[PDB]
Amino acid sequence: VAPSMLFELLLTEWHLPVVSLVGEERLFAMKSWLRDVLRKGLVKAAQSTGAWILTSALHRHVGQAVRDHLAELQLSLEKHISQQRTSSIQIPVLCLLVNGDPSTLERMSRAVEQAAPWLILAGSGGIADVLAALVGQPQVTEKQFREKFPSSWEAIVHWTELLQNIAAHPHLLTVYDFEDLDTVILKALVKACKSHSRDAQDYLDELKLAVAWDRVDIAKSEIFNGDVEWKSCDLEEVMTDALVSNKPDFVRLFVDSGADMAEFLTYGRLQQLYHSVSPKSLLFELLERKH
């Protein structure tokens, strides 16, 4: 099944104008406290803009929570998704695993090969804890898998090989012990960006996200002071957006980042700014009359 068919069916038949779930399918589930944390988190992360939540539509208060707020196809759609759309070519591609399975190690390794970020929940207590302790673990790990998940030497060896191949790229692997979701989201995303390659354009997408979510302090602590040393011109465009967004602090960071307004601003830039004012604003009404 081509993912374009899925895209059209989501757009038209369900009238729609990305976070992928590849977990929660095991016998073990997360407790009430944890479902509440992830519930409030999905609510807060989704209430900012209009996005879709890609999950498996298999089975009251947590459903009220969401309301108030096989494998190759999924990975291919995510890769197409992250790869383009869905001058910045990077969008919000996200994977979240809860209560992993030994049968789903293949999809996880394949997604890692496609350079997809992954979230591991220590509070989940499923096969996530397996990988968390595996980061420390070196045989006995496969035995702990077999005992904790009763649902085999061959299976133990296969799970060991999958865990070894996964541990290969732990840069995008980040632990979420819910026992702030937006900040860990952004931290995992910037870690995934920095792992592969460090560049201004690469971090630019994460910066756009931060501006969207106004986590300016986290952006300062983890990105600018952290690694990147910036160029004047590349930054310029960024400021414009922030300037329109009524986000003042970001501007302070940017001039602190070495952005030079004396050369940043152009009369055309101000023309754009002034044309980009609220029509409901009375100033705009007076401007219309004067013009």
Side-chain angles (χ1 to χ4, degrees), residues 2-3 17 23 29 41 45-46 50-51 57 63 65 71 92 95-98 100 102-105 108-109 111-113 115-117 119-123 125-126 128-136 138 145-146 149-150 155 167-171 173-175 181 183-185 188 190 192-193 195-202 204 207 209-213 219 221 223-224 226 228 230 232 235 237-238 240-246 248 250-259 261-266 268 270-279 281-284 286-287 289 291:
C95 179
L96 172 54
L97 161 70
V98 184
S103 86
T104 69
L105 300 172
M108 302 191 252
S109 88
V112 167
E113 295 164 354
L119 183 46
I120 185 169
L121 314 193
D129 288 16
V130 188
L131 317 162
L134 177 73
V135 188
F145 149 74
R146 179 60 178 163
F149 306 102
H169 302 91
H171 298 270
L173 276 298
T174 43
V175 52
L181 310 96
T183 185
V184 302
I185 288 171
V190 62
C193 295
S195 195
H196 173 65
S197 87
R198 277 82 63 194
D199 204 330
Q201 200 285 299
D202 289 345
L204 169 146
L207 301 156
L209 168 145
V211 180
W213 267 3
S221 45
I223 293 90
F224 289 163
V228 62
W230 268 100
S232 54
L235 284 170
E237 306 74 359
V238 183
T240 65
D241 312 68
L243 268 47
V244 191
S245 56
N246 197 1
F250 276 111
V251 196
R252 175 198 303 285
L253 295 107
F254 296 141
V255 291
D256 298 8
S257 79
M261 318 301 298
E263 207 48 46
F264 156 84
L265 186 44
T266 52
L270 194 48
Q271 267 160 328
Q272 214 166 8
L273 293 151
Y274 266 111
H275 191 48
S276 64
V277 296
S278 157
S281 72
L282 67 96
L283 166 64
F284 179 82
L286 317 166
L287 291 168
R289 305 166 44 184
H291 177 66

